[PDB]
Design a protein around this ligand. Structure first.
Ligand code: CHL
Ligand code: CHL
Ligand code: CHL
Ligand code: CLA
Ligand code: CLA
Ligand code: CLA
Ligand code: CLA
Ligand code: CLA
Ligand code: CLA
Ligand code: XAT
Lengths: 230, 212, 217, 213
């Protein structure tokens, strides 16, 4: 009745197209339990929204600041607030925001009220889609926009993973890595730099230093699952 | 089971029913269920008031003396840290002061305890028998001579909430004095000046990591 | 029903109404020592006396030890105090102990006769008018009367909770004294010295590294 | 009708095919008594799940050592960890039996008295320790994703996979011990040597397994 991830297949029973972005993909049956699916549905949106901002953020950083590698931006950035001053502010602000989001998930409607100003409240809403002040402008139908959000979100989640593994394998940002592919497309793919055959395994070298010195301490910087690289 | 109209320490949470809102400052906070038993809750309510009122006097007795010294006011006790007041030389030895203290506090504390056991039974002066507190007082809120200006005749419910709120904040402040003095080795207002001088590099994380 | 071992079969003799009325009944009697009701009554008295003596003894070791470390007092180690005290004493330990046996024996005998015939020490004329105060209460092991000056036991709503606190702290005190004896031989230091040494380096200073407790390792 | 370990031989009466991995294999009749069989079913699952963890841990670290990431061999890891990190062996050993003793004893008394650990005695937790079946705890803590709380048919398939992968891991761990004793090398050194010359580097030529050769 609806397009599927694998055309011609039959979606699992627990998937019926109610959710946006429901293309009948759950081969392991992780979402069969209703309670689990509610938590996983919330988690997918959060991962997707974080990934979309991060992928957009990384791309703009490279264009605006091509001289700084996004993978190194943690140590290269110097601000007066210092390391622990920034972390302390981030911890408390994120703890408040995340606990309130969490409470809505457990008990929907219980954190729609503004704690300080008694006249402001979020109108009733679905979990994961807090309207009101968070949605001043809605260009069109929500149902269509929800599909657009999750599809772009699932693409940005894969894009970030592509940035991480490309950075560790090439040591270059997403745009610089792309230009390397375009210069020599036949000699720049992962197949062109790695291969395993019976009796020999060749893997690229991790282009990230094993450790980073930062303000008098050493921060380990290991490549992700390097021993399992092709 | 707790009424949903009452304010909550954690909006949306389901809180115990025995904290029905009669006591002042009832926000339903009891994650360890210490006050579940009504008999113990009665004692804890008084203990919270007693520790709260001594903490408020103690905190005010540690900041104002230090604030006055910083301003420039001069008096023999000026410039002495609250944790060095014991060694200071007074008109009498500290041992004799302690002895007088316990005798005086035995009288007033046993008078207060008598009211808690049997409210209204300690409202009369034992020497000048004419003097007496009003018969309507409750344990923890004597009134009468203890409320000469009659503030208790106004919005008592709000005033009790203000008292416990300031009291709970004062109790945390005194706990901060012990922790801050033990780790920084300086007076509380000197610690505040250090934080205001450079807030971003003077957090407890910065300070304790250096001492680590 | 609280149990020392959730899911185990509670002994039948600890599930009777009489046994469940004892303070600290968590169904713990693997050896079946208290299976006989008469024996359980006697062992309940023994546990209370051990509890109260251990609490006083452990408090007499731990509080002076903590104050000695803080400098408020100067008391020797609990295992050296007997020698230090006797040197500055007015009597040899033999005469001191003999008097103790006479005085302790007298009060212990009166308690003993009360266990056999509860309330019997109130026999008129036996004591010089004081026997009226020696009848005890309805519960064996809780004499009350002159033994409860503040009258805390008269509060019925708090009686069960008071008894549970006494037995719980008493059982803890007994294990603490057994810990003092074992730690004295294993480490050759004081109880507070052992606590400080553990806190200084918990992962390398404990009983697995004292060279005595675990010889196979 | 179901496939059996020895085609043609009828399965024994006490193996009726309900349990996962039931192939009628019990030639010594060790699980004939139903109460003994329940205990053995859990013993096989505990062995299998520990072997699966051990096989995956040995394999991963062996790969790291092979590709020169600095990992020790599984038969050398114990010495390297304590010496490198300055860890007292007896202290680590004692902590292990405290934590395993607590978890194992609670598992032990759920077998003796099912559902007895769900009364709330442990920190007030009730449902997470109720248990679902003999050897299959379930619940939010042991099954956070609730894969046993969804499709029943899917759940039965996972049980078949778990025990079969568990039996294979148990055999593999036996292989690691036997191969280390025979060759003195790591599992992937053995695999690499076999692949280089399969016909001439195998157990028949290691000088130990076939002494008469
Ligand atoms: C989404 C979060 C996030 C991610 C994915 C990264 C990713 C990265 N950072 Mg960055 N950082 C992140 C947040 C932050 N970083 C920094 C500060 C730094 C520094 C100073 C450095 C990096 C570096 C790196 C890189 C390598 C780090 C590594 O391998 O560490 C291995 C792992 C660890 C060292 C610890 C892992 C901790 C654990 C996964 C999470 C712990 C969670 C907390 C307990 C939660 C409580 C705190 C609050 C705030 C949430 C990598 C690109 C390094 C770099 O540039 O290398 C070239 C580097 O030097 N980051 C801050 C402080 C403002 C962050 C705040 O959120
Ligand atoms: C709320 C109750 C309360 C609290 C929290 C404190 C807290 C403190 N008093 Mg204080 N006192 C309190 C009530 C009282 N004190 C005293 C009398 C004293 C004295 C006389 C002294 C203190 C000192 C101390 C400190 C102990 C730590 C230390 O430096 O040890 C190490 C101890 C020393 C370096 C002091 C050595 C010289 C001292 C003359 C030896 C004899 C001290 C006594 C044994 C103190 C007994 C205090 C008891 C009765 C509360 C600490 C800041 C000491 C201080 O200020 O040290 C800087 C101190 O000397 N207090 C009295 C009697 C009026 C109290 C009555 O309630
Ligand atoms: C599945 C269990 C298990 C097995 C099969 C092994 C097997 C081994 N460990 Mg390991 N360990 C195991 C559990 C543990 N080890 C350690 C801690 C260590 C250390 C610290 C060391 C080993 C070492 C060894 C090796 C030599 C054994 C030995 O000295 O035997 C002789 C002793 C006996 C036969 C007595 C056994 C009594 C039971 C061998 C490969 C040694 C090694 O790697 O040397 C190179 C070594 O130094 N293990 C811990 C953490 C407490 C374990 C916890 O369960
Ligand atoms: C996931 C989010 C994220 C994170 C963690 C970072 C992190 C970083 N960015 Mg990046 N960035 C992001 C998103 C993100 N960015 C996005 C979406 C954009 C596009 C607009 C950019 C554009 C950008 C540029 C152009 C630059 C960085 C730079 C930096 C670095 C220094 C930051 C700084 O100095 O802040 C200082 C902070 C302030 C002065 C105040 C900022 C207040 C903002 C605007 C409020 C935002 C509110 C919003 C609702 C938050 C949503 C969060 C999330 C849910 C998406 C740091 C590594 C700099 C860099 O590379 O330095 C080496 C740099 O030049 N970022
Ligand atoms: C600072 C500590 C530290 C360091 C320096 C290393 C270093 C290494 N680890 Mg290890 N690892 C650690 C902690 C550490 N690990 C912890 C705490 C965990 C549990 C989460 C793991 C889990 C782990 C796995 C699963 C694997 C490695 C592997 C590796 C190797 C390649 C890098 C990699 O894939 O990392 C990946 C590690 C992380 C993403 C966790 C970093 C935590 C800070 C390398 C020798 C790989 C290897 O070759 O193993 C044989 C590998 O597959 N590590
Ligand atoms: C909990 C209440 C409390 C307690 C126990 C103390 C205790 C003490 N105060 Mg503090 N004080 C308090 C509250 C308290 N204060 C309050 C609310 C204020 C008003 C802001 C002050 C203002 C104050 C000053 C200005 C001084 C003290 C000083 C003292 C010390 C001598 C007391 C004395 O001579 O009394 C005399 C008693 C009467 C006059 C009656 C002593 C350690 C002195 C000190 O620390 O000297 C070194 C000192 O100079 N106190
Ligand atoms: C009554 C609340 C209160 C206040 C206003 C302060 C204020 C301060 N503390 Mg103190 N502190 C407190 C309680 C408080 N503390 C308590 C209860 C403890 C015992 C654990 C400590 C232990 C402590 C240490 C060990 C240190 C400080 C330090 C500091 C400074 C800030 C930097 C820092 O690391 O803070 C960390 C403070 C905390 C984690 C306290 C958290 C608990 C309080 C009650 C939170 C209240 C939040 C609430 C919204 C109200 C806050 C605002 C209001 C008062 C206007 C600053 C002078 C540092 C310093 O001296 O720097 C020079 C420092 O090293 N405090
Ligand atoms: C089971 C109980 C018990 C026993 C058998 C002992 C035994 C001993 N104690 Mg210990 N003690 C105990 C409990 C006990 N204590 C408790 C509960 C405390 C309070 C925490 C102490 C505090 C304490 C101190 C501080 C000292 C001892 C000392 C002694 C030794 C000398 C006893 C003596 O001369 O008594 C003589 C006493 C009497 C004949 C009757 C009691 C006299 C006091 C002053 C009356 C108190 C009344 C009270 C305040 C109301 C001796 C080894 C001394 C020691 O070790 O010296 C080397 C020593 O300095 N004890
Ligand atoms: C029951 C199985 C088992 C056992 C007994 C061990 C035991 C060990 N592993 Mg292994 N491991 C296992 C399963 C197991 N592993 C699995 C399933 C994986 C994932 C495939 C790994 C991945 C792994 C890595 C990546 C590393 C080890 C390492 C270690 C050693 C240190 C462990 C440590 O410090 O933990 C304490 C850690 C925690 C409590 C965090 C949780 C030790 C010999 C380390 C090693 O080789 O050190 C030399 C090491 O780097 N293991
Ligand atoms: C009384 C006591 C200690 C008294 C100590 C005193 C007076 C100390 C006094 C002094 O220290 C001072 C103050 C100061 C020092 O300078 C001098 C001395 C003189 C040294 C300890 C009892 C200590 C008693 C102990 C430890 C008893 C433990 C019993 C256990 C574990 C029984 C278990 C079971 O019996 C059950 C319950 C049920 C069965 O089915 C199963 C089993 C297992 C058999």
């Amino acid at each position: 009745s609806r397009p599927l991830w694998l055309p011609g297949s039959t979606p699992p029973a627990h998937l019926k197209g109610d959710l946006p972005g429901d293309f009948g993909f759950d081969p392991l049956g992780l979402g069969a339990n209703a309670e689990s699916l509610k938590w996983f549905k919330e988690s997918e949106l959060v991962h997707s929204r974080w990934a979309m901002a991060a992928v957009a953020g990384i791309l703009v950083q490279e264009i605006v600041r091509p001289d700084v590698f996004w993978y190194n931006a943690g140590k290269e950035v110097e601000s007066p607030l210092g390391p622990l001053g920034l972390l302390a502010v981030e911890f408390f602000l994120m703890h408040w925001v995340e606990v309130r989001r969490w409470q809505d998930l457990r008990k929907p409607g219980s954190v729609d009220q503004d704690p300080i100003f008694s006249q402001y409240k979020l109108p009733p809403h679905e979990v994961g889609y807090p309207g009101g002040v968070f949605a001043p402008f809605i260009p069109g139908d929500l149902a269509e926009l929800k599909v657009k959000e999750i599809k772009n979100g699932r693409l940005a989640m894969l894009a970030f993973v592509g940035f991480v593994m490309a950075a560790q394998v090439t040591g270059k940002g997403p745009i610089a890595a792309l230009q390397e592919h375009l210069a020599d497309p036949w000699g720049t793919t992962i197949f062109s730099k790695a291969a395993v055959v019976p009796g020999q395994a060749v893997a690229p070298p991790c282009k990230i230093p094993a450790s980073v010195s930062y303000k008098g301490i050493e921060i380990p910087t290991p490549c992700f699952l390097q021993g399992l690289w092709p | 089971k707790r009424d949903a109209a009452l304010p909550s320490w954690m909006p949306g949470a389901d809180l115990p029913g025995y904290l029905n809102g009669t006591l002042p400052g009832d926000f339903g906070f009891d994650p360890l269920y210490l006050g579940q038993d009504p008999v113990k809750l009665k004692w804890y309510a008084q203990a919270e008031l007693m520790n709260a009122r001594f903490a408020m006097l103690a905190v005010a007795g540690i900041l104002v003396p230090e604030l006055l010294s910083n301003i420039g006011f001069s008096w023999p006790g000026a410039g002495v840290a609250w944790y060095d007041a014991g060694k200071f030389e007074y008109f009498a030895p500290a041992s004799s002061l302690f002895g007088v203290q316990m005798l005086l506090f035995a009288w007033v504390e046993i008078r207060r305890y008598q009211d808690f056991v049997k409210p209204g039974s300690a409202n009369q002066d034992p020497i000048f028998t004419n003097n007496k507190l009003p018969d309507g007082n409750e344990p923890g809120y004597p009134g009468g001579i203890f409320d000469p200006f009659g503030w208790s005749k106004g919005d008592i419910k709000s005033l009790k909430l203000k008292e416990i709120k300031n009291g709970r904040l004062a109790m945390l402040a005194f706990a901060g004095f012990i922790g801050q003095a033990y780790t920084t080795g300086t007076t509380p207002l000197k610690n505040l000046s250090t934080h205001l001088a450079d807030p971003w590099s003077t957090t407890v994380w910065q300070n304790d990591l250096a001492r680590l | 029903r609280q149990s020392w071992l959730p899911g185990s079969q509670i002994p039948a003799h600890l599930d009777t109404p009489a046994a469940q009325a004892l303070a600290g009944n968590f169904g713990f009697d693997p050896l079946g020592l208290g299976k006989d009701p008469v024996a359980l009554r006697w062992y309940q008295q023994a546990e209370l006396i051990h509890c109260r003596t251990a609490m006083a003894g452990v408090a007499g070791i731990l509080i002076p030890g903590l104050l000695t470390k803080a400098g408020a007092l100067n008391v020797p180690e609990w295992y050296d105090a007997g020698k230090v005290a006797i040197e500055n004493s007015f009597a040899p330990w033999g005469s001191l102990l003999a008097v103790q046996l006479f005085l302790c024996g007298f009060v212990e005998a009166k308690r003993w006769q009360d266990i056999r015939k509860p309330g019997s020490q109130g026999e008129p004329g036996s004591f010089l008018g004081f026997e009226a105060s020696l009848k005890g209460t309805s519960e064996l092991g809780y004499p009350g009367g002159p033994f409860d000056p503040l009258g805390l036991s008269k509060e019925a709503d708090k009686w069960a909770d008071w008894k549970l606190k006494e037995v719980k702290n008493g059982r803890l005190a007994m294990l603490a004294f057994l810990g003092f004896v074992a730690q004295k031989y294993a480490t050759g230091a004081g109880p507070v010295d052992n606590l400080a040494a553990h806190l200084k380096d918990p992962w390398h200073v404990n009983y697995a590294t004292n060279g005595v407790s675990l010889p196979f390792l | 009708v179901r496939p059996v370990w020895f085609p043609g031989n009828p399965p024994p009466a006490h193996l009726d095919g309900s349990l996962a991995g039931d192939y009628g294999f019990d030639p010594l009749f060790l699980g004939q008594e139903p109460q003994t069989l329940k205990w053995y079913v859990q013993a096989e699952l505990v062995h299998g799940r520990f072997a699966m963890l051990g096989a995956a841990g040995i394999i991963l670290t062996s790969i790291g050592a092979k590709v020169g990431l600095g990992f020790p061999e599984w038969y050398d890891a114990g010495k390297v960890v304590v010496e490198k990190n300055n860890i007292d062996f007896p202290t680590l050993m004692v902590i292990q039996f405290y934590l395993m003793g607590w978890a194992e004893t609670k598992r032990w008394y759920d077998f003796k008295n099912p559902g007895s650990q769900a009364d709330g005695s442990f920190l007030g937790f009730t449902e997470e320790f109720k248990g679902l079946e003999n050897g299959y705890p379930g619940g939010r803590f042991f099954d956070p994703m609730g894969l046993s709380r969804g499709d029943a048919a899917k759940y039965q398939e996972y049980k078949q996979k778990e025990v079969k992968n568990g039996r294979l891991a148990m055999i593999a761990c036996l292989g690691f011990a036997a191969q280390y004793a025979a060759t003195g090398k790591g599992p992937l050194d053995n695999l690499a040597d076999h692949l280089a010359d399969p016909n001439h580097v195998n157990f028949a030529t290691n000088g130990v397994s076939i002494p008469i050769a």
